[PDB]
Every structure is written in C-alpha cells, then in structure tokens.
Design a protein around this nucleic acid. Structure first.
Lengths: 188, 106, 68, 170, 151, 48, 49
RNA sequence: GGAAUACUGCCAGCUGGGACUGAGGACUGCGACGUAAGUCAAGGAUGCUGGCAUAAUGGUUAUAUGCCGCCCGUCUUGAAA
RNA sequence: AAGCUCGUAUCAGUUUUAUGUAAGAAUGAAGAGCUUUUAGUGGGCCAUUUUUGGUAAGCAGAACUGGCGAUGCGGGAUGAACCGAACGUAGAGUUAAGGUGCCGGAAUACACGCUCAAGAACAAAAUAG
RNA sequence: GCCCUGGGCGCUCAAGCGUGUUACCUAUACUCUACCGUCAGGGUUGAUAUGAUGCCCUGACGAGUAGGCAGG
C-alpha cells in the first residue's frame, strides 16, 4: 500500500522484526529500518552476549547493530538466489534516523513489539549495548546525534500542534452550520 | 478525476508448491485489504491482469498484458489462487497485478 | 452501575434501566465513533458523492476563516 | 467440550442370579461411544464383569440444573500415575459441572501430565456454603465486593503496520 | 440447399437445449444508475432504461449529461446502485436488438437520442446533485474495499 | 443376493476431512477406526 | 407402503421409549442387525489374515 | 405454568457466488409438463455477440526466472559402497 | 503352452459350532481338476521369537513368522530397515503421514498451566496433592 | 510435572512442553471426467451409406529383475 515503509526498530524483537520484514519484502514491498541500535532481544545481558561468540569462533563478522539485524534477516531469506538477492536489495538499515528518513513518518509492527510480546518482569537485552560490548565504537556518536534529532523536532511538533489548534478552531466556528449538520448526518 | 483506477491492486506471491515440487499452472495472488476467506470470496471469478512494459513495439501500444481468472481461496490469510492462459514467468514474484471488478455480481 | 452479586436477568434489567446505561453509552465518544464507522460503512456511492461535495463546500469556508 | 452420561448395566442376568446389582455411575465423555467404553473399562477394573458379559441398559445425557448459577464443586479424583495410584481431592469453581470437569482434566494434563485414559472421576459434589471450601485459590474469589484490574492488555492488531505505537492501558 | 452432399459428413444429434430468457439479478431494475467497468465509456455513470432480447441492457448516459449515447451493454460489466430514477416517462419500445445492427452518425439515431435525453433530463433534475453526480466519473481511491463498499 | 448384486461402493475422501489429527487410532480414543455407530452416517455422507 | 412402514416403526420406537421412561422401567432397544464397513488403510503392509 | 432457544438428525425444501468439464453425433428407451395438440433441465453445448489477410495465432532457439536432478555400463553383495 | 470334462458345489493364509474329520453354518470367487512338457530359480540383509544360556562382557550358536531382494512417489535436514502409499497420459475436487514466524503452502489460531536454562539412552541415586 | 546442576535463520503470556477445540497445503493416495492399449462379454447380412482380418457398445485392469508371449 505504501511505496516505501519506514520501520522504527526501537522496542521490537530482533527475530520477529526480521521475520516480518523478510516476509513483507519477499513480496516486493520496500522496507527501511531505522534506530536499529535501539532494537531489543529477549533475555538479560548474559545468554545474549553468549550465542554470539559461539558462532563467532568459527569468515567475516560485523559488529554494527544494523549488520547484526541484516545477518538475522539474511538467514531468513533464500540468499544465493536471484529472488533472494533481489529481495535483499529492497532493504535498508541505519543507526538512528539519518535523513531524508527523519522528515517522513515511521511505522511500527504491533506483532513484534517487546511490550506486547514479552511478559512483564523479564529481563531483555538491547542491540546497542551488545554491539558496544562486542567492539562497536559508534554508540556514543549515534546517541549524541540522535538526541540532536529530537532537538528542534520537538519544536517542529509544537509548531504543528499550534497550527492544528487554529485548524480545529476554524472547524469549530464553522461547525454546527447547515452544511456541517448535513455532513455529520452522513457520517462525515 | 485524480485517480483512474478501477481495479483492486494485488501482489503475486508464488505458485502453489510443495517442499520440493511446484505447480506453475496455479498462481497465488494477494489482494490488498483482504485477510479472510470470506472477503476473498467476493473476488472469485474476477478477471486478473498483469501489466508490464515491453522493449519491442507491439500491435499499437508499448504495454503487454497477461489475463487470468480467480479460481479459489488459499490459506486463511485471504490468499486466493489465480489461473492465467499463459503462466507467469516466475520472475514477477512480488510484482503488482490488477484485479478487475468484472464480471460483477452486485 | 450498582448491581447485587449474582443478580438474575430481571434484577439486572431493572438496574440497567434505572442506571440509564444506554444513555451514558451514547454520550461516550466511543459509541459515537462506532456509529460513525457504521454510517460510513453503510454510505452509498451517491451518498459518498454528496459527502464529497459538502466537504468541498465546507473547506471553501474553512480555508477562508484562517489566514486572516 | 464434554457431556455427562448416566450408564447402567446388570451383567447379562442369567439363571440363579435374577435382577443383578445393576451397577450405576455417571460417566463423562464427548460422545455416547466413549462413555460406553469408559463404563466398560471401569466395570472391568472395579468389578468382576467384562464387556462380553454385560449389557448397557440405558444411556441418557444429564444437563446441569442451573447452567447460569455460579457454583463450587468438590471432586474426589482418583487416577493412575507413574507409580501405583494416588487418590486426589480438588475444588473447582465453575458455572456448570461439565466446565468444572473439563478444567479439572486440563489441570491434570498440565500440572500432572495425566490424560483421560488414566483419570477416573469418582464423584463430583456441589458446595455452596462458605468456609466449606479448603483450597486457598478457590477462597480467593469468595470475598465481598471483590474487584481486581487487568493491567497490560494485549489487544491484537489485524494490520501488520501500526502508526499509533499502541499503549497497553485498559 | 439442393446440392447432394459430395461427402457424407455425419449429421449432428438432436440437441436438447431450448433457449430461455435471461434471468437478470434482482438488483438490476429499470431506472437504476449503472457504472461501466470496461469499454470506451469505462468509469462513466449511466442510467438503466430497458432490457434487450439479446441479453444486453439498453442504457443511456443520458447522452447530454456525460456524452454516453444509447448503446448495448452486458449486465456482468455493470454495477447496479441503489438510486433509481422514474424511467416510466421514457418510451423505450422503439429500441430493439435490430436497432443497433451495425450493418457520419445516422440522423435518426441522433433524433432518438435527443428525444430520450429531453424526457430523462426532466426527471434527472428533479433531485439535487443528480446531474452533477452523473457528470462525475466513478473511480477508486486508496483504502477503498469494493467487497465492503455498499453500491 | 441384494448385497452381492451391488458393486462395492467407490467413495471419495471426506469433504471436511477426517477431523482427528491421526486416523490410525481407535475411535473411542480420538482415532478414526473402530466403532463409530452414530458418526458412521456423518462419515459416509462427508465421503459421499 | 415402505414410507408408511418406516414412519410407523420410528413412531412406535419413540412411543415405546417414552412409555418406558414414564413407566419407571428400562427399554432395551433392538440390537442393530446391519453395519456398513469402509476401508481406512491402504494395501501396503497389511498383515496376511 | 408455558413459550422457546441450546444440541443431534431429516427435508425425493428454497435460493445464489466461484472453478474444471462440452465427451457422444439423424429417431428408436426410461420419465415430467399439458383434456389434447405439442413442449421439456428426460440415455453428453445450444444460440448470440466480439478480432482477422501488411491477419489472429502457432512454431525453432539464446539467456533468464520458482523447484527438482550424486557420472555412464559391468560385477561383487542381502545393501549403499 | 496345448487336449478332456465341468461351471458347476471347486475352493479359502477368513470366522463360528460339534467330535478333546461334520455343519439343508457366515462371507467371496462359480475361473477348478485331470494328464504331456518348458525357461528362469538352491545369493541373502534385519525386528521378533522359538530358545541352548547367560557372565566383566558379548551375543557364540541358532531360529518362527515377517519388511526388501527387482520399488517408484509424499514427509522425515540426508539414509536400506521409519510413516503413508505402491505407478498408463492430463484436468477438477478430497486426503495420509508431515506441517502452518521466514527459507516453505498454509492460523505470529483459540483455551488451560508449566520452564529462565536450555527446550524443541547413557554419566538417574537424591507447582498441585 | 517442570527448570540449572547429576536443518539454518531463529523464539520466551514461545515460534519450547502436555492436553483440549476449529481453519488450511499437498503424493502417482481416493471420486468424476478427457484419451492409448490388454482382457472378458455382447451387437453385426436376403450384406455394411470403410478390408466379418471390417464398424462398434459395455466393465475392469495398466509396477517390475531373470524369463516367456505378442505387435511393429
């Protein structure tokens, strides 16, 4: 339905998000993933640092959270095939929200959120912490310039809220009229 | 008018197939806004067309079209099986297809 | 609304009538949204065209109320 | 779903033994055939009578008198486990006997990994007076003006993409 | 006719298939507004005038409102709306299957179209927005569900 | 004589399936074979 | 005649059951004398007998 | 006290939507409609419409796409080897 | 393969009753017998279960019926000892084992509890009643 | 009873475990239809509106090493 979909990785499970993205873009849907560093994995820090060195001690290994997510997505797609290679060309993963994706709406997957999937009172791991612990050196800059992203975007939202205030006032003053009642009668 | 569309958009997923055996004669088509067999029941019998651009000139256009028909529902997520006079090239997996409204029953 | 534990059908209906539950439900925005969704689902094509025309007319004045 | 079936038999009355004991028991099953099979199995296990030496006099479904009244039922459960057999007693709060026995079977299959074959329902007795219930988890739902919340609801979304970032509030 | 068969091709058997009149769906009623799904006038809104003996439907735009003239159309390529005009005032007896035989437009056809339009416009204008509604071409929009839309 | 005159019935698979996940078990224990006195009619109608 | 016989037989069976219930006794239904059999397994690996 | 409803089964009850199939080749027969003439869904598709001779369509081959396919014959042996 | 008779009362890897072979018993084929001769066949692998019996052990020795010999096809990551099912060329339809987060076609189905760690015969002996 | 001690990608109100109720995918498996052949039966002329060595109707069947038979 959407020519390009931007998915906010924060608060989502790596496995569920990877599976849903693989299924979606295997059907030709273009998907973009942002804020991968904020992606979460179930379980406390231990047993999440583990199971990574286990396969590491075997090739080339990538420490960036985006590369980890791609590897998770890569194994869920029939790579080495033209369809698999073509499907993987419709995927983009970045840390934070670099432009121009910062100026566009970002969606989430209800069936992949940690809150809706993980039972309360259970420890969970975050991709950023694991990446830093396994040698990632860009967490500091990622956080620093993500905080700046919220800066002045709060101001943009405030301006939008102010504009919508005037829009609502204009609607209300024109409301209750004959045309307004006619529209409300037809569910609009 | 802004939009000239008179058909429901859909995506071609893959042919009906087993683990190691596939049946190209029967294609699976996903219909936008359809997620249950009951909803897909309305689309049964409707003509489905696939539109793609060609490199060489044709009999009065530059677009070539492959027509098909809906046969039966598939799965539980609203997937529907479609049949065409000429089977799809298997390269359209994930491509966009046009599900027309005729023949109508309303 | 108030209701004794284990109230039978007659008592439940009596309490429902006394508490004006139906009146409260209609006032809630949730019931209004449900009714609006049902009306939109039941909208006819000609009704949809009328809605479009009325929306255009209303916007013609809404856009003039602002900017001045 | 399950149903309650009353089954009787008098071991094929013969000469010198007219009008036998006419064994009676209330079997629980999903159909008449299963009820008859379980009745035969119980008769063989607990009595000196076999299927080939018996006759089902009658079988009629018994529905709960008040399928709307909330009641508490005491069950004297007897079942076979990995070692010998152990009698068990449990209290289940349910509107109807069928639901109570179904929940008991589910609990046995969950907390004991026992199945219908090894589970015998000796007797189910209704309890209505307070202070007669013994299990704490059943007394938990007998306090006056009991009210509890349902935090962290998990309402499902049909569409795979949501722009609302849904909240779990209730 | 008179030539003896120079090669004895076997004759066909007595086929037991008697022709029967088309049983149109109840939704199709005269005076109903129709939406064309294909053809030259695809997407146009049309008025249902009369049923023809060749399983086609005699329809009119009317021609004056949207330019669609009197033409034959198949019921399977048409969606019947719930809005119906009083077509009783339009004389449709003249139109028949042989009328549309294709053997610069014939003058008689233009006269018949004008006569039909004159009668139909009076009823069309009898209700608000009917002229504008018929002048608007129907089209789908994002999020539209034809299996849910109540036509 | 009547039974032998009729050719053995050639029945198709049930329209709604066999229901139970595994057919090769006694009907009294959630299977598909055995004594299904009352349900035999439904099984035949589904297969027919 | 066959339809009448079937209707009378079913009505008589139901009436007898109801009378037995009312009379405080037990009615032993006549044992079924006809059973249909359907093959559920394939030809392969079927034991000889 | 009485309605129902819940559930099982019956309808030689009614009414649609979707997919494949058109096999036989002048009448012999079993049936229905109708007082009769005649008709019929009754031992296998009938009628209409739409495109066509710088045709319509079909065919050969290179690549490509979704899936499958251990290198051929012989002998060892109960087997793969 | 060929000749006679008979389609008849001729049989059965089926069942039950009687004698501790009979049935004017059930079911299916009526397609069987009587003589002459004519290719190939005397390779076996494994579960049981007869048993000879067991102490570092092992199975030495066997043996009773069965799966395969020459056997495709679907599932089991692959497999000869597993499950279904055995084969003319295609269409429609319904299923088996096996599955339904992706690879892979299908419910991130419904309901009850269990477990933070894997979990999806051998190092075994120490949350409800 | 369970948890730690004695196919890959992946998952934890599981996408793990036991049981319970429904929706669906398919094999050469089964129902019907379309066609090739084998078998069995039957129809056939005071001659056939195509070789009685012809033209047909009906039902089932169709795996396979050595070996046997038949048609090209």
């Amino acid at each position: 339905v959407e020519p390009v979909v931007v998915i906010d990785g924060k608060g989502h499970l790596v496995g569920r998000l990877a599976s849903v993205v693989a299924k979606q873009l295997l059907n030709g849907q273009k998907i973009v993933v942002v804020r991968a560093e904020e992606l979460n994995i179930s379980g406390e820090f231990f047993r999440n640092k583990l199971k990574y060195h286990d396969f590491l001690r075997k090739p080339f290994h990538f420490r960036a959270p985006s590369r980890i997510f791609y590897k998770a997505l890569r194994g869920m797609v029939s790579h080495k095939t033209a369809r698999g290679k073509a499907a993987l060309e419709r995927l983009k993963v970045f840390e934070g929200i670099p432009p121009p994706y910062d100026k566009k709406k970002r969606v989430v997957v209800p069936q992949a959120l940690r809150v809706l999937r993980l039972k309360p009172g259970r420890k969970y791991t975050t991709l950023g912490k694991l990446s830093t612990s396994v040698g990632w050196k860009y967490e500091d800059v990622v956080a620093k310039l993500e905080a700046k992203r919220k800066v002045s975007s709060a101001e943009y939202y405030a301006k939008k809220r102010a504009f919508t205030k005037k829009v609502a006032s204009a609607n209300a003053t024109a409301a209750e009229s004959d045309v307004a009642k006619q529209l409300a009668a037809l569910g609009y | 008018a802004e939009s000239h569309r008179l058909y429901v958009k859909g995506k071609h997923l893959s042919y009906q197939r087993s683990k190691r055996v596939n049946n190209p004669n029967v294609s699976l088509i996903k219909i936008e806004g359809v997620a249950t067999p009951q909803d897909a029941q309305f689309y049964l019998g409707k003509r489905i067309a696939y539109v793609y651009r060609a490199s060489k000139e044709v009999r009065g256009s530059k677009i070539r079209v492959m027509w098909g028909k809906v046969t039966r529902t598939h799965g539980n997520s609203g997937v529907v099986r479609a049949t065409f006079r000429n089977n799809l090239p298997a390269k359209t997996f994930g491509a966009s297809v046009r599900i027309f409204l005729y023949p109508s029953n309303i | 609304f108030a209701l004794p534990r284990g109230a039978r059908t007659a008592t439940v209906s009596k309490k429902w009538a006394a508490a004006a539950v139906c009146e409260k439900w209609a006032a809630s925005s949730w019931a209004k949204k449900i009714a609006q969704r049902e009306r939109r689902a039941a909208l006819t094509d000609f009704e949809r065209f009328q809605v479009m025309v009325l929306r255009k007319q209303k916007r013609y004045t809404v856009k003039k109320a602002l900017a001045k | 779903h399950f149903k309650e079936y009353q089954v009787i038999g008098r071991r094929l009355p013969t000469e010198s033994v007219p009008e036998p004991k006419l064994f009676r028991m209330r079997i629980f099953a999903s159909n008449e055939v299963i009820a008859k099979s379980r009745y035969w199995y119980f008769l063989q296990k607990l009595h000196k009578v076999k299927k080939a030496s018996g006759e089902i006099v009658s079988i009629n479904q018994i529905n709960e008198a008040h399928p709307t009244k909330v009641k508490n039922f005491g069950v004297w459960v007897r079942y076979d486990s990995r070692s010998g057999t152990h009698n068990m007693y449990k209290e289940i709060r349910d509107v109807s006997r069928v639901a109570a026995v179904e929940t008991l079977y589910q609990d046995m299959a969950a907390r004991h990994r026992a199945r219908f074959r090894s589970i015998h329902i000796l007797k189910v007795a209704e309890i209505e007076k307070t202070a007669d219930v013994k299990r704490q988890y059943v007394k938990q739902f007998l306090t006056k003006d009991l009210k509890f919340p349902l935090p962290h609801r998990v309402q499902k979304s049909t569409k795979t993409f949501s722009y609302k970032r849904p909240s779990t509030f209730y | 006719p008179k030539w003896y068969p120079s090669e004895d091709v076997a004759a066909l058997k007595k086929t037991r298939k008697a022709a029967r009149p088309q049983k149109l769906r109840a939704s199709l009623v005269p005076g109903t507004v129709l939406i064309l799904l294909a053809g030259r006038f695809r997407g146009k809104r049309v008025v249902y005038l009369k049923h023809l003996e060749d399983n086609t439907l005699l329809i009119s735009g009317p021609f004056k409102v949207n330019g669609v003239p009197l033409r034959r159309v198949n019921a399977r390529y048409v969606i019947a709306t719930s809005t119906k005009v009083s077509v009783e005032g339009v004389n449709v007896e003249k139109f028949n299957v042989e009328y549309f035989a294709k053997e610069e437009i014939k003058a008689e056809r233009v006269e018949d179209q004008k006569v039909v339009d004159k009668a139909l416009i009076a009823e069309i204008k009898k209700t608000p927005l009917l002229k504008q509604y018929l002048s608007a071409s129907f089209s789908l929009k994002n999020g539209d569900k034809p299996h849910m839309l109540k036509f | 004589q009547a039974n032998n005159f009729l050719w053995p019935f050639k029945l198709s698979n049930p329209s709604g399936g066999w229901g139970v996940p595994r057919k090769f078990k006694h009907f009294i224990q959630g299977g598909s074979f055995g004594n299904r006195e009352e349900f035999i009619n439904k099984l035949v109608k589904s297969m027919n | 005649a066959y339809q009448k016989e079937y209707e009378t037989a079913e009505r008589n069976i139901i009436q007898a059951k109801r009378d037995a219930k009312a009379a405080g006794s037990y009615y032993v239904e006549a044992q079924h004398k006809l059973v249909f059999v359907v093959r559920i397994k394939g030809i392969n690996k079927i034991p000889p007998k």
